[PDB]
Amino acid sequence: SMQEEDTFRELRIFLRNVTHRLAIDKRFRVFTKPVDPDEVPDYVTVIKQPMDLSSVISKIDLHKYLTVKDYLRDIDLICSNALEYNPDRDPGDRLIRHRACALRDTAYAIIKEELDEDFEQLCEEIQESR
Numbered sequence: 001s002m003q004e005e006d007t008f009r010e011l012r013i014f015l016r017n018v019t020h021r022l023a024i025d026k027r028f029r030v031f032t033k034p035v036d037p038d039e040v041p042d043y044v045t046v047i048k049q050p051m052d053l054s055s056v057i058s059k060i061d062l063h064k065y066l067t068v069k070d071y072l073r074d075i076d077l078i079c080s081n082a083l084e085y086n087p088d089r090d091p092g093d094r095l096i097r098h099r100a101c102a103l104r105d106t107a108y109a110i111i112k113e114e115l116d117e118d119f120e121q122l123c124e125e126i127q128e129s130r
């Protein structure tokens with residue numbers, strides 16, 4: 001229905017705002033764009049399902065997220081991919097892991113503070129009826 005489409009549009013507006021706030025954070029610059037194959041060639045090999053904040057924005061605009069849970073699974077994927085690609089004790093790897101975990105923590109904290117739980121439940125119940 002029209003009211004249901006209004007609900008998903010409000011969700012997209014909210015998700016764009018969260019994603020923008022993550023993308024402008026200097027700590028998260030390494031996650032804003034796909035990994036460039038030149039600067040690092042083994043990434044395409046190790047990481048089967050790449051995700052970054054620019055791809056998240058594209059999926060929002062393609063109406064791919066109908067719930068907050070669909071969105072956070074892609075935030076979770078940005079994080080888990082970074083931990084998998086950077087497992088070593090060396091400081092370069094450790095720095096990316098710390099930033100990845102901070103990105104995930106920040107997104108969850110924004111949603112916990114600013115998303116009404118009844119709004120997320122509505123999105124869920126609309127989606128379960130489709």
Ligand SMILES: CC(=O)C1CSC(NC(=O)[C@@H](C)NC(=N)N)N1
Pocket residue numbers: 030031035040081082085086092093096
């Ligand atoms: C998005 C992501 O996970 C990235 C982007 S650059 C990076 N890691 C590195 O440049 C070094 C520190 N570690 C390697 N294993 N090459 N990890």
Ligand SMILES: CC(=O)C1CSC(NC(=O)[C@@H](C)NC(=N)N)N1
Pocket residue numbers: 101102105
């Ligand atoms: C997913 C993962 O590997 C981890 C390990 S610890 C973490 N986040 C934290 O400890 C946040 C909540 N606190 C900080 N003072 N940083 N995330």
